[PDB]
């Protein structure tokens, strides 16, 4: 045989997606949650499960506290990460981890101990023969199919922009805004308290997130949309809670994602995502801005609100000089783009030389990743 | 209806057939052959028999009953025997085996195969 | 009409036919031929098998990819093979071959012709 397939695991704050190198789609997609029972079990012989990992934790949300191992792109709890990776390797893919190389993705700017801890856990516990760490928005450009453009990745943890021209990345132009989907979920809860509906527990946060995913969109003109929603009730929708109660979302549908463009709603003084993209473009040199304007690529699940592409194009066109081409490239499957391009990175023949070997880790320790990746 | 689930259950079918043949190869000694992996492991008696023929060691005798609690007890005894045989099982519950989740049963079989070599 | 590039263009409009007719004879030993010197050289497989015919030693496996990056891989493998055999090339990159620059492709073909025979 030779050249065995190397598995790729994309971990974000929201979901974990794992799959083989050659496939165009991941095998397993499941949320990164670890739940533990609150109450005291009373039936003898029911069986004892200490912790719930993955989809069945979303099934049994009532009797558990939902917790997230990743917050803002940084792994806060590492035992939960070991649980997540074990459930990924042995239950979802059911493959031996010590016989395949592993590819992993991470945010651009993060604490430097995170890479070392991932490398140490991947080598010492799972005994993988090789592993590599890559930036998510670089892999998004591989999934795009072009070697020139600026990638704007918005996920559950962070939002980051990076420009790459002719295969060369400019490190000083990288910006990392902290707005993400979980902040939008919290803001949606806060504005849903205005109509009388109260969501406090961790299990109901998933319900609010589903409401956000199903009944939200980005208005093209926000203040016009406010006038239209105040004038009539045509911009109203109904949602059904799991217990049968019916709520009416009404006005709030375009108020939740509008906070992405004006962060002052959350009390943050940082600029919007469109201004972040424009500033990342403007930090580059004069000659490469023309190619960066015409190859802006959207990525991440958070960018699947309907109408975000037209709004982003309008704002960037307003900021940019009038005589240039501005076009926003939005793949219909962009939620998996960080995975998909990563799979392409595991298929190239020249990539076999830059795996981090076990012998190199033994010689240099966990710091070798800072020399080998990026 | 989706590409991800199509690839997933395309893998599940082949792995299920291979696991069924392996389990029947080790269960040919006792007069028990399982036709479907998901349906027959729901009781939990054949899994206890499989463990005590693989390890060559006694296990506690199963509780006799038709009801759900007896099935949970029978699965829990075998899970506890695997647990004291130093083997690390993640996201494993007796009610998951009783309810018949595909991924968890296949993962338990895979872990048993890889740890009892 | 820019007499300089006019004289240039009359040079490579004949130079192209000369190189195409030269390369088709060596490529005819395999069941392959090229109708255009710029467009079929973009994929990178044709020059790889041209080097197969000329050198007599095999090259690494071409990548079965329709992407631009796979084309860059395929051209880069052959360029590394040319660099292995003492051949000197100036500002010759895989993206130049993929983008179909006229004079760089012609210079690469002319360098191959000069070096091998």
């Amino acid at each position: 045989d030779d050249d065995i397939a190397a598995l790729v695991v994309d971990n974000g704050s929201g979901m974990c997606k794992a799959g083989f190198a050659g496939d165009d789609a991941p095998r397993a997609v499941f949320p990164s949650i670890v739940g533990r029972p609150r109450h005291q079990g009373v039936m003898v012989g029911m069986g004892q499960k200490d912790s719930y990992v993955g989809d069945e934790a979303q099934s049994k949300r009532g009797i558990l506290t939902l917790k997230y191992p990743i917050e803002h792109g940084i792994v806060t709890n590492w035992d939960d990460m070991e649980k997540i990776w074990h459930h990924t390797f042995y239950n979802e893919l059911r493959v031996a981890p010590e016989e395949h190389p592993v590819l992993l993705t991470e945010a651009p700017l993060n604490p430097k101990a995170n890479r070392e801890k991932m490398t140490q856990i991947m080598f010492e516990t799972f005994n993988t023969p090789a592993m590599y760490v890559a930036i998510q928005a670089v892999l998004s450009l591989y999934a795009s199919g072009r070697t020139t453009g600026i990638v704007m990745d918005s996920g559950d943890g962070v939002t980051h922009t990076v420009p790459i021209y002719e295969g060369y990345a400019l490190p000083h132009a990288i910006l990392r805004l902290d707005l993400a989907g979980r902040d939008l979920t919290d803001y949606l809860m806060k504005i849903l308290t205005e109509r009388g509906y109260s969501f406090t527990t961790t299990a109901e946060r998933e319900i609010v997130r589903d409401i956000k995913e199903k009944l939200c969109y980005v208005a093209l003109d926000f203040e016009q949309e406010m006038a239209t929603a105040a004038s009539s009730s045509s911009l109203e929708k109904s949602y059904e809670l799991p217990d049968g109660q019916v709520i009416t979302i009404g006005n709030e549908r375009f108020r939740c994602p509008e906070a992405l463009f004006q962060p002052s709603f959350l009390g943050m003084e940082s600029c919007g995502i469109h201004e972040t993209t424009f500033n990342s473009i403007m930090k580059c040199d004069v000659d490469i801005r023309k190619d960066l304007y015409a190859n802006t690529v959207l990525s991440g699940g958070t960018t699947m609100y309907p109408g975000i592409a037209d709004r982003m194009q309008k704002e960037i066109t307003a900021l940019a000089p009038s005589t240039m081409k501005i076009k926003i490239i939005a793949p219909p499957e962009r939620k998996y783009s960080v995975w998909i391009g990563g799979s392409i990175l595991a298929s190239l023949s020249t990539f076999q030389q830059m795996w981090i070997s076990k012998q190199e880790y033994d010689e240099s320790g966990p710091s070798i990743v800072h020399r080998k990746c990026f | 209806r989706s590409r991800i689930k199509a690839l997933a259950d395309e893998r599940e079918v082949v792995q299920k057939k291979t696991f069924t043949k392996w389990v029947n190869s080790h269960l040919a000694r006792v007069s028990c052959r399982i036709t479907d992996l998901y349906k027959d492991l729901r009781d939990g008696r054949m899994l206890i028999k499989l463990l005590e023929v693989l390890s060559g060691e006694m296990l506690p005798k199963p509780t006799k009953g038709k009801m759900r609690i007896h099935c949970l007890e029978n699965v829990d005894k075998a899970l506890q025997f695997l647990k004291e045989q130093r083997v690390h099982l993640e996201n494993m519950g007796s009610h998951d085996i009783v309810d018949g989740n595909h991924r968890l049963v296949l993962g338990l079989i895979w872990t048993i195969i890889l740890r009892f070599q | 009409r820019s007499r300089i590039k006019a004289l240039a263009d009359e040079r490579e409009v004949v130079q192209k036919k000369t190189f195409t007719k030269w390369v088709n004879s060596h490529l005819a030993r395999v069941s392959c031929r090229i109708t255009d010197l710029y467009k079929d050289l973009r994929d990178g497989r044709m020059l790889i098998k041209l080097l197969e015919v000329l050198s007599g030693e095999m090259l690494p496996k071409p990548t079965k990819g329709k992407m631009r990056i796979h084309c860059l891989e395929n051209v880069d493998k052959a360029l590394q093979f040319l660099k292995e055999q003492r051949v000197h090339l100036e500002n010759m990159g895989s993206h130049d071959i993929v983008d179909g620059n006229h004079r760089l492709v012609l210079g690469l073909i002319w360098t191959i012709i000069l070096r091998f025979q």
Binding site: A5, G22, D23, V95, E99, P331, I344 | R11 | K64, M67
Partner: peptide
């Protein structure tokens, strides 16, 4: 029996055949 026969590792790579990975439709998505 061996690792390779037990685990159904796909020999074929679907990503290589697709010319445009940008233009994939996993779901109609409405």
């Amino acid at each position: 029996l061996g690792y390779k026969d037990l685990a159904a590792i796909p020999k074929d790579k679907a990503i290589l055949d697709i010319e445009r990975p940008d233009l994939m439709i996993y779901e109609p998505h409405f």
